[PDB]
Amino acid sequence: AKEAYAALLLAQAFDGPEVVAGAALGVPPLEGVEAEVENVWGSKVPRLKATFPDGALLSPVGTPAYTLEASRAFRRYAEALIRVANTETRLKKIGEEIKKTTRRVNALEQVV
Amino acid sequence: MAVIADPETAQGFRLAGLEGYGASSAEEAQSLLETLVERGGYALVAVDEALLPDPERAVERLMRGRDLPVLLPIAGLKEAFQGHDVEGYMRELVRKTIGF
Amino acid sequence: GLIKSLAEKEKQLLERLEAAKKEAEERVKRAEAEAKALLE
Amino acid sequence: DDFAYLNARVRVRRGTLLKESFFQEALDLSFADFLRLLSETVYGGELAGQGLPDVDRAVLRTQAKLVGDLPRLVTGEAREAVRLLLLRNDLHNLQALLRAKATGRPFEEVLLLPGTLREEVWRQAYEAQDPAGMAQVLAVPGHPLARALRAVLRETQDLARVEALLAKRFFEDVAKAAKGLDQPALRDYLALEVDAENLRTAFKLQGSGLAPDAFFLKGGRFVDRVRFARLMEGDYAVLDELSGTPFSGLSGVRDLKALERGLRCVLLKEAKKGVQDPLGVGLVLAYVKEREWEAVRLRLLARRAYFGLPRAQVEEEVVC
Amino acid sequence: MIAPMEKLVLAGPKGRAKELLQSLQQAGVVHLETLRPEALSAYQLSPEERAELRRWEAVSAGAEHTLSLLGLEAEPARPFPEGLEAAEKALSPIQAHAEGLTRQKQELEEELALAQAYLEPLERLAALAHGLDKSPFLRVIPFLLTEKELPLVEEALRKALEDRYLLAHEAYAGGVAALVVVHRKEVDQAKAALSRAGVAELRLPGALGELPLSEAARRLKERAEAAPRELSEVRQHLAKLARESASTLQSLWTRAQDEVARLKALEELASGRFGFALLGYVPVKAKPKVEEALARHKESVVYNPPWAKPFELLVSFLNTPKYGTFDPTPVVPVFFPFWFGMIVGDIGYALLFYLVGRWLSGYVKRNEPLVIDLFALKLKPQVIGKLVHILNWMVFWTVVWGVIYGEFFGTFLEHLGVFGTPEHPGLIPILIHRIDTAKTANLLILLSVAFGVVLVFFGLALRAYLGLKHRHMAHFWEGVGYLGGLVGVLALAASYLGNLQAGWLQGLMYLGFGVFLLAVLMSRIWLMIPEIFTQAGHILSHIRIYAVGAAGGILAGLLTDVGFALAERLGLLGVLLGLLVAGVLHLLILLLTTLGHMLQPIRLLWVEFFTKFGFYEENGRPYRPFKSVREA
Secondary structure, three states: HHHHHHOOHHHHHHHHHHHHHHOOOOOOOOOOOOOEEEEOOOOEEEEEEEEEEEEOOOOOOOOOOOHHHHHHHHHOOOOHHHHHHHHHHHHHHHHHHHHHHHHHHHHHHHHO | EEEEEOOOHHHHHHHHHOOOOOOOOOOOOHHHHHHHHHHOOOOOOOOOOOOOOOHHHHOOOOOOOOOOOOOOOOOOOOOOOOOHOEEEEEEEEHOOOOOO | OOOOOOOHHHHHHHHHHHHHHHHHHHHHHHHHHHHHHHHO | OHHHHHHHHHHHHHOOOOOOOHHHHHHHHHHHHHHHHHHHHHHHHOOOOOHHHHHHHHHHHHHHHHHHHHHHHHHOOOHHHHHHHHHHHHHHHHHHHHHHHOOOHHHHHHHOOOOOOOHHHHHHHHHHHOOHHHHHHHHHHOOHHHHHHHHHHHHOHHHHHHHHHHHHHHHHHHHHHHOOOOOOOOHHHHHHHHHHHHHHHHHHHOOOOOOHHHHHOOOOOOHHHHHHHHHHHOOHHHHHHHHHOOOOHOOOOOOOOHHHHHHHHHHHHHHOOOOOOEEEEHHHHHHHHHHHHHHHHHHHHHHHOOOOOOHHHOOOOOOO | OOOOOOOOOOEOOOHHHHHHHHHHHHHEEEEOOOOOOOOOOOOOOHHHHHHHHHHHHHHHHHHHHHHHHOOOOOOOOOOOOOOOOHHHHHHHHHHHHHHHHHHHHHHHHHHHHHHHHHHHHHHHHHHHOOOOOOOOOOOEEEEEEEOOOOHHHHHHHHHHHHOOOEEEEEOOOOEEEEEEEEOOOOOOHHHHHHHHHHHOOOOOOOOHHHOHHOOOOOOHHHHHHHHHHHHHHHHHHHHHHHHHHHHHHHHHHHHHHHHHHHHHHHHHHHOOOOOOOOOOOOOOOOOHHHHHOOOOOOOOEEEHHHHHHHHHHHHHHHOOOOOOOOOOOHHHHHHHHHHHOOOOOOOOOOHHHHHHHHOOOOOOOOOOOOOOOOOOOOOHHHHHHHHHHHHHHHHHHHHHHHHHHHHOEEEEOOOOOOOOOOOOOOOOOOOOOOOOOOOHHHHHHHHHHHHHHHHHHHHHHHHHHHHHHHOOOOHHHHHHHHHHHHHHHHHHHHHHOOOOOOOOOOOOHHHHHHHHHHHOOOOOOOOOOOOOHHHHHHHHHHHHHHHHHHHHHHHHHHHHHHHHHOOOOOOOOOOOOOOHHHHHHHHHHHHHHHHHHOOHHHHHHHHHOOOOOOOOOOOOOOOOOOOHHOOO
């Protein structure tokens, strides 16, 4: 990622200022979080794919240049973030059970 | 989204089809804390670990059993993150777990 | 500069209005008195 | 005749320029030293103090005075030429404004560079309501950009197209105006400028896989429609047809970044040629170009120190 | 409606405001606002009002938009009371319908075009192709190529395909629509052959490009046929919408626009005045009186005889104030004798310009078009022509009097005792011309000089008035002070003009004349002395400009010798009319130059005027370019 971020600053650190307008809006910013159930023992919680694009093309010529490839990097934020977004929601499931579980384990073993 | 990172570098992400807005002056992410609750929902939610936020119990104390979209903490630029991966691994594995 | 004239007159109106609300509340404060008294 | 006056002054301005070793030194410096180092050199005299933003802003403001007010000062061909440079800054400004206006993203949200066209014009421009009106605001200073917009408007009046077709149209417009402007070096440079723009354009838009025809910029002479078409298909062998061209290091290149690196320098070596220009503006242009390359670098190296980035990270990009 | 306590708006030159304000107070008006500076105080505004206004704007704009797609736009005439809502409503069905027709109509034109282009080459491709369009066992690739290109692609193909293609072309002129049929397996190699070449496939828009060619062809063919007829229908409907709806559109337009202004007016004044002019509020007892008159100095927006005629209109423009020094107006009565009086022609020069004037009140037929100058129809603004009837009078007069000093001229270029010239000969008057002759000429030249003298006085006198009545001692002394010089100037000329008189007679007087000048120029102190040389250029200029107005005039009359008395052979009464081959031409040449002529006067005048000698337009400053000013 960090490539592009840093390649902002190249000839467009200064045109970050420009860019933040100048490239910004070819796509809905924000949400598209399409909440997903994974339904198992380990109940149901929301996961999601925020399945709306994060876009990157909206400008012509390839305009100022750094922009397009860099904006293309944003993809590789979005998409990638999903893996972890969805594995950790599984984590939270996996916490619960174990914890809860043992609570009863204990109880049975330790009073009943 | 709802991101913060290094603000300036978060900036790029947030531009196309994405979203963040917080700034560096709450290094615990007040920057998220309130903001999150401002709608109570965003595409997702993420952070710099600089903006120290796995005190997400802070967040939980507001959310109160709400399923907010929740962090990915980030160091905002390369400088070896693989620690808090294998650590992120420990973050369950020590403490959700028979693992220690 | 006539000016003042119209820029004051709108003010003249206000001090009678202000005075109205006050004169208003008194009627209620009257009813407050009776409302206790008759019940005691 | 008469560039004499221009020439003497600019030579005095050229005195404030830095050692190469600055850029080298910078490679290893801390941010505090970065601040000191810039503050001891000419952009530095309005350095806004401590912090990275201060640097960027200083660079802008320093150019604002050193370049930005130059065109006015008589109005011969050269003066027009300076006007064109600063006008490119205007062109961006305009685009941004257009977008701001278009995207329902108010007046506040835009900030602009120095140019021939400056804040108040812009303020009016934003504050002009209609796309027709915007173009008419441009008619206020009267420029080929003015002309370009009015021409662009005839078919369409909404941002994205207006901009695309405008950019193309505009560059065509510049070319003609430039045929009327008669520094041979700049004439050559325009064709090459056209070419460079095509190479990068073709490069960014390659893998669209499309016709050259949608956005083949024109005035190419190491380029033509076919090469454009080819590159757009993915074909770096287009770059390998470079062989004895000025653009000669672009052969063996596969990626846009490297492409751009090579290009910026190629254009720079050429840009530096105009030195002791008779009509001054080879030299003034060069002074400008160099100031850019310098400026870019100040900022690069600044980041490098500021964020504590590796040497190797800028080492590539501080060399032409 | 809005402004229920009800608005009047008056607009104007900034200076006039107090006097305007007074005129408005008198009328029956009350609650006069803002009255210097601005920002009313409980007589302002709210976005609700604005919103409703916005609705009027939407209609207003909409009426125009729909009117646009059809073509033309409306004119100020009859609005009508509407619901705003009603107006908005009204616009919607009709506009949508028309708009709908429009939308189809361009699409139809494009269709027609595209279809026409593609059908024939595609037909050629189809004709070769049959049976093998279908097959994907085998693959076929259409592309068009030209006939030089027929060897180049053929080579690309030859290298890839070898002979495992059989290679076909069918003509349609401009090239041959071409097929390669190859195995499906061979397809990349074949496409690639085209790619190396840069030869292009006849892929076509839409679903159509993609298709089996034969089938595609059928659809394409249908489009070609269909579109003009379709177009006719849509076009009829659109045309129909203009015919009926044009009045409707206008009435709506007028209303919507006026409303938009009306609404706006209320909003700007609400807040913050006209600027420097004046708003204000009437109960309806006050409302009738007020608008009708309140003296011309301003523009409002509502909730012998020859010598009198344009001047009469200047009387009002005298009355607009700014200062105690006198205002714009003078120009029109000042110009006229000389304006006309450069024109000093003859039978073929001046004296035929009536016909043209008679083509501004009668017209012409004999070439293309003109019908009525009163109805001023045109190639470039019509409108103006109606307005400039004030000018049509002055022009008809310009020629009439101009012809007349031509006829003064022909007193002295006819009559056999005065010159050698004929009284009235067998050729034409003004015959072997002689005003050219140096001594005769000298008098006409010296004639010119005099008008320039008048102007010297007129300007500097007005400066002394400037400082007198605008009170500036600085202006007063400047305008007065230069006249201190003048007696001595008159001395210097006179010693050559009489060859004697002065300059050595009144040249002793010069010695004292030069000091008097610099006294009050010195009273202002004035390091700003040097300028006085330059003033010396100006006097001479008056002469020269007039001189040319004569000389170029005179030259013009002497050109009719080489126009109409002579120009090949020597011109008698047949070769004379061999000059008439040229003669008709000379009229049109004459026309061109005379446009040039008049402008020197005004330039001359402007020298004086815009040295602020009676005029407060000058380099801007309220009042407006003189070009625009004097004409009424």
